[model samples]
Target: SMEQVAMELRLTELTRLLRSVLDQLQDKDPARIFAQPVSLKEVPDYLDHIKHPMDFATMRKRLEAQGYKNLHEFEEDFDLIIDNCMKYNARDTVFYRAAVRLRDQGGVVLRQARREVDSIG
Candidate 1:
């Protein structure tokens, strides 16, 4: 137990912070657009254009699996989810706007976690 105690404590902290981050995005997406993976049938070129796709659902699962070791790792997924949208959708489109909006808001949350709670780093 002593060997893994530090690792387990860090994982618990990350999981808690990750949930707060995911919840913020989920709450902001009123249209439920970023809730899950993009349907290939609807956006056939999504995979082709966006090589790295990310979503809230995938992030949630990643958190559950304790896939991230640090706050920056989680931030990557947050950025990917929004970046994919801006990459796939046109600048004039609503999707792009939402992505930009989410990143602006989510960035603040991530910064706080890194500065305040991520002392383990």
Candidate 2:
């Protein structure tokens, strides 16, 4: 029904966003700068230990209640607490930003830019 559609939409969007956030987590450092477990299989372990356990159901509520406002904010958090690979124990997160940006843009393709002056003119 109409009542549930918006709620469902919100949930779906937020769920996707959180999953996107989860998919983030890069294993950069090894200390609290702790890039412990950088595999998809291990992100949950990290989440389950920090902040609040991100065991899907629990984190879903947290996210819906207002953990994430936008993709950028999610990114901000990732850069702050999640995997913060920008300063101190810096890690190569350029690929992280690139991946997220690519995913947000619905995945991108790389091709060399060229100028074909008068091929068919």
Candidate 3:
């Protein structure tokens, strides 16, 4: 599925970003700053807890009602969120986790859209 593929790609990109951030921060003081390894598995669950520009349910319902049923339809919006996440500081694990979670959720939504498409055909 293209959405799942895109989502996996997004996850890869995010994990890379997280690693880069950790690398840059590794030399900092441990007592002054706490560092923890970020896990890819935790990302999706983290995103599920977020309330974005709007909530996920509302956004999904609104888009589905408008006949925008494919992951492609939301790709631009999702990418923009990714862009924002990159600008956001990763020092806050809560925010970082939330960012990853959102990205993963977008991927899940994309997967669902693909299933919807398959069902239609």
Best by lDDT: 1
lDDT of 3 by residue, 1-121 (tens): 9999987665554444333322333323222121232233755544444334322333334443443334454455445444445444374665555555556554655565456545643
TM-score quality measure for candidate 2: 0.33
lDDT of 2: 0.40
- Candidate number achieving the greatest TM-score relative to the actual structure: 1
- Model 1, range 5-110, lDDT digits (tens) per residue? 9789878877887787778768878877788999889888777898988888988998899888777788888888898898888999989999888878777777
In model 3, the worst 10-residue window by lDDT is: 29-38
Query: lDDT of all the models against the reference?
Result: 0.82, 0.40, 0.44
Q: Where in model 2 is the C-alpha error above 4 Å?
A: 1-8, 27-66, 81-86, 90-121
Off by over 4 Å in 1: none
Q: Model 2: how far is 63 from its true place, Å? A: 4.2
TM-score per candidate: 0.89, 0.33, 0.36
- TM-score, model 1 to reference: 0.89
How many times do residue backbones clash in model 1?
0
TM-score of 3: 0.36
Task: Rate residue 105 of model 1 by lDDT.
Answer: 74
